[PDB]
């Protein structure tokens, strides 16, 4: 699958500095959808501003978790069946924490933003399409967690 190799090659670049890259993703996310900020409630407190989130080790750990789940998806690009059940429960978990399935569209745009910014000219039309398909497949599996 040529799509899979474009994903593998672009991810190599990102995966070298995952927290730095995931930081861009989350900064962009809160800039687009500020109402996601209160959902991260560590030690029973909510973050007042997006910059507060960046000072939180728990929040930064969650960036690492996100980048790890993406890494699993890239590893399993040719077949996400090994990941379907895990991703369904991951959706269920995010439903429980208060995330609306609708917000995963903004997450997608934030992912594509991070990739465009990191890769520059190497973020070709084909690369963008490949990532949009992989992300779509991930969200499809996660969406099963929202009761159906
Ligand atoms: C809309 C954006 C998101 C929000 C508001 C959100 C919120 C949360 C919260 C509150 C937790 C529990 C606290 C914690 O573990 O730090 C969590 C856990 C987690 N998140 Fe997210 N999340 C988002 C997106 C994602 C995405 C897209 C992924 C996958 C690529 C992801 C991967 C994970 C993982 C692996 C955990 C640990 C779940 C567990 O095993 O308990 N997160 N998230
Ligand atoms: Xe952020
Ligand atoms: Xe963790
Ligand atoms: Xe993501
Ligand atoms: Xe993804």
From Swiss-Prot:
Monomer. Homodimer and homotetramer; disulfide-linked. Mainly monomeric but also detected as part of homodimers and homotetramers. Interacts with 14-3-3 proteins; regulates the phosphorylation of NGB. Could interact (ferrous form) with G-alpha(i) proteins (GTP-bound form). Its main location: cytoplasm. Phosphorylated during hypoxia by ERK1/ERK2. Phosphorylation regulates the heme pocket hexacoordination preventing the association of His-62 with the heme metal center. Thereby, promotes the access of dioxygen and nitrite to the heme and stimulates the nitrite reductase activity. Phosphorylation during hypoxia is stabilized by 14-3-3 proteins. Heme b binds at residues 62, 94. It is an enzyme of class 1 (oxidoreductase). GO terms for molecular function: GDP-dissociation inhibitor activity; heme binding; metal ion binding; nitrite reductase activity; oxygen binding; oxygen carrier activity. Transmembrane segments: none annotated. Keywords: Cytoplasm, Disulfide bond, Heme, Iron, Metal-binding, Mitochondrion, Oxidoreductase, Phosphoprotein. Its EC number is 1.7.-.-. It catalyses: Fe(III)-heme b-[protein] + nitric oxide + H2O = Fe(II)-heme b-[protein] + nitrite + 2 H(+). Residues 1-147 form the Globin domain. This is Neuroglobin. InterPro entries: Globin (IPR000971), Globin-like_OT (IPR050532), Globin-like_sf (IPR009050), Globin/Proto (IPR012292).
């Amino acid at each position: 699958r040529p799509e899979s190799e474009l994903i593998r090659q672009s991810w190599r670049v990102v995966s070298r500095s995952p927290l730095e890259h995931g930081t861009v993703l989350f900064a962009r996310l809160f800039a687009l959808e500020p109402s996601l900020l209160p959902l991260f409630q560590y030690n029973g407190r909510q973050f007042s501003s997006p910059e507060d989130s960046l000072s939180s080790p728990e929040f930064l750990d969650h960036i690492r978790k996100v980048m790890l789940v993406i890494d699993a998806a890239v590893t399993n690009v040719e077949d996400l069946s090994s990941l379907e059940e895990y991703l369904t429960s991951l959706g269920r978990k995010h439903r429980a924490v208060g995330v609306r399935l609708s917000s995963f569209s903004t997450v997608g745009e934030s992912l594509l933003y991070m990739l465009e910014k990191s890769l520059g000219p190497d973020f070709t039309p084909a690369t963008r399409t490949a990532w949009s398909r992989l992300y779509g497949a991930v969200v499809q599996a996660m969406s099963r967690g929202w009761d159906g």
